[PDB]
């Protein structure tokens, strides 16, 4: 069946009989927002690879390459906790929706999980999760006992935290999976990879449900749309694609002429009408997620921007970057 | 409020105990060891980021031998462009390997994040390519076809045999030719020839010229 894939993929292309940005081109766009730096969270020293927000929309963690996981206050610019790491080649970080747990993880093939609310006044390492053989690249949190890690041995996983070992492993990836996003609809997640595909996996079932190819080059940014029915992919060739889980084709790909370099992070506002993407041109960019125009540029950084996140209500947006400064807009 | 005024001697007290910690992550020099197979890169100086540290003239170095799934090196190499030098080790051995292990030096040189950091070429086991050619059975002209067409220029190495130094300087000129083709003056290669104990100091006085070629550009000279 070497040629069997060319018949289903050509038939599924017929189910996608249009694009996105022609029906929403006539609607009222964003225009030009200048989400200026309300606060500016200074204190990291090396570059910054990942931040994750809080559930209360006022705390956030951030992961840096000096071996620090700093828990911030979005309101008073306050170092709530600064968690010293052991493996400082950190490429990802996460925050539990209970607000009790954070988890780091990077090139040392390991996901360490940290407990926030404790007695004896600390943030302790709860469950260090070995079991990967490649560089860990995106950890998330579905529950205080469910973490979905993506790694550099081409394997997505799923773990029982209290036990200490995996419950599932999600294979089917040629290149390394770089970035993962859990869904609001709690039974699915998605992960893009270096082989320009993005295998929609399944939390409850076990096997990777759908596939999503379409980039010219590798992929390093995944985020769910907040309805859980779509998601946007940020690649390393200045193409920021969006898809749909039950359509499997390209929803829209936000591209401009002046961007030639990689798109390190992708996030979404609470409306699902602000696609925020962090590029290698030493500055962010606000895309309107429907009409796909440059409707805002969050140029405040001097080096490449690697992370992004909108709150659980849409109020603020923090961006870290390699300038060691994480800058919350409003 | 006095609660939030006590939630602000956190951020002024974390930085007292964090910026004093982040001033140790810039006093040691970073290197990146990168050798393919049977290259002896674990034996040049003496869980998946096996990293060693060594200090010469009181300058702590810190190289990162990264054991990955394959030699693609595409996406974990972005973490190492704050680094002074990529120490590249490759052996004096079979010539079907040294046409791929010199197509290794060409994907490290023509990279994107590595377009500023200058690679060190650290050729190991210098006393095992003579023993490959003093036996004479090594068909060096077979794999490398243009080897017999040229010969050595002056300033040869003092066991000063010309038939091996014609080959010793051939592979070095084979890699400098892939170095200085498209290098743009920002980064240049620094070849060597050693399993000897002249290995550590030859990275010390060589990363200096990687630094000194930035302060000839940073300090407006």
């Amino acid at each position: 069946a070497e040629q069997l894939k060319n018949q289903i993929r050509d038939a599924r292309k017929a189910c996608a009989d249009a694009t996105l940005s022609q029906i929403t081109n006539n609607i009222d766009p964003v225009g030009r927002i200048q989400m200026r730096t309300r606060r500016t969270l200074r204190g990291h020293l090396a570059k910054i690879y990942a931040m994750h927000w809080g559930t209360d929309s006022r705390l956030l963690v951030s992961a840096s390459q000096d071996g620090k996981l700093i828990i911030w206050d979005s309101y008073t610019t306050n170092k709530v906790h600064a968690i010293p790491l052991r493996s400082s080649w950190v490429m990802t970080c996460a925050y539990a929706p209970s607000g009790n747990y954070v988890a780091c993880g990077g090139l040392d093939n390991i996901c360490s999980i940290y407990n926030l609310k404790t007695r004896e006044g600390n943030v302790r390492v709860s469950r260090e999760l070995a079991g990967h053989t490649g560089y860990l690249s995106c950890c998330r949190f579905l529950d205080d006992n469910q973490i979905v890690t993506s790694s550099g041995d081409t394997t997505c996983a799923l773990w029982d935290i209290e036990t200490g070992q995996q419950t599932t492993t999600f294979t089917g990836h040629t290149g390394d999976v770089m970035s993962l996003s859990l869904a609001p609809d709690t039974r699915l997640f998605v992960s893009g990879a270096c082989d320009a595909s993005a295998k929609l996996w399944d939390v409850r079932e076990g096997m990777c449900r759908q596939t999503f190819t379409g980039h010219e080059s590798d992929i390093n940014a995944i985020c769910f749309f907040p309805n859980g029915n779509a998601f946007a992919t940020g690649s390393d060739d200045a193409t920021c694609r969006l898809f749909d889980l039950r359509a499997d084709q390209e929803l829209m790909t936000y591209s401009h002429d002046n961007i030639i370099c990689g798109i390190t992070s992708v996030s979404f506002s609470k409306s699902g009408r602000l696609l925020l993407a962090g590029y290698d041109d030493f500055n962010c960019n606000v895309w309107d997620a429907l009409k796909a125009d440059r409707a805002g540029v969050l140029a405040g950084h001097d080096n490449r921007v690697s992370c992004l996140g909108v709150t659980d209500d849409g109020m603020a947006v923090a961006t870290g970057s390699w300038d060691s400064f994480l800058k919350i807009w409003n | 409020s006095a609660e939030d005024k006590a939630a602000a001697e956190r951020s002024k007290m974390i930085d007292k105990n964090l910026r004093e910690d982040g001033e140790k992550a810039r006093r040691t020099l970073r290197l990146l060891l990168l050798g393919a197979d049977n290259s002896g890169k674990s034996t040049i100086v003496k869980s998946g980021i096996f990293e060693t540290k060594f200090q010469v003239d009181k300058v702590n170095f810190h190289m990162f031998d990264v054991g990955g799934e394959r030699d693609e090196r595409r996406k974990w190499i972005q973490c190492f462009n704050d680094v002074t030098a990529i120490i590249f080790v490759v052996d004096s051995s079979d010539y079907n390997r040294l046409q791929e292990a010199l197509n290794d030096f060409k994907s490290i040189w023509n990279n994107r994040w590595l377009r500023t950091i200058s690679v060190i070429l650290f050729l190991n086991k210098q006393d095992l390519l003579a023993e490959k050619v003093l036996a004479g059975k090594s068909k060096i002209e077979d794999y490398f076809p243009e080897f017999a067409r040229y010969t050595t220029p002056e300033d040869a190495t003092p066991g000063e045999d010309p038939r091996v130094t014609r080959a010793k300087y051939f592979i070095r000129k084979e890699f400098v030719d892939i170095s200085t083709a498209s290098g743009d003056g920002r980064h240049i290669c620094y070849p060597h020839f050693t399993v000897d104990t002249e290995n550590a100091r030859r990275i010390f006085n060589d990363c200096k010229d990687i630094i000194l070629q930035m302060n000839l550009r940073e300090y407006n000279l």
Partner: single-chain antibody
Amino acid sequence: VQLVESGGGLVQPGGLSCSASGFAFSSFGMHWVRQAPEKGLEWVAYISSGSGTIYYADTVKGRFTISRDDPKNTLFSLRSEDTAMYYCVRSIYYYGSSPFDFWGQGTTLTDIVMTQATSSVPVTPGESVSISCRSSKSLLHSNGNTYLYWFLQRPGQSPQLLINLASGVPDRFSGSGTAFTLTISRLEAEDVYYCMQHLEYPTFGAGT
């Protein structure tokens, strides 16, 4: 996190330490709270994280001192109001914290005003034990968080915390600006209630 203080000896008022054990006091506040043999609670002192944000009682400003030996996680001119039993408070503040919670075993040697709301009620189980409270000013800041601190105690023992809803305490314990009520139901045994505020260094308004 088991805390403990030092007792102290009976000395005339005008002629202490909380050597707590086995936790991280270098990231916690370190209070003192006096409790009278006849009346109840009153605030005493403070030292924050970092050597020195020291407050003092208005009747003890210049009296016995407070400290924090943050390496060892330890701690090192009275009156008739200062002839009370001192009991310590563990607390630390961040945007989501539940401060004031753990109390030492302190029965030691011998102001924005807030209401009391019938300070003498005996034990009636089974039904709602709803106590109201009020303060002389609007506790609610512009952020949107009413900073009320409603405490508990035990007959012949140390205090604890009930109100939001702190930790280490049971579940059955449970408002507006300038006036707020609680809805506690289904009272059980091992039950000296309190309600305080901490918007400034003055202090609960009563002594129940």
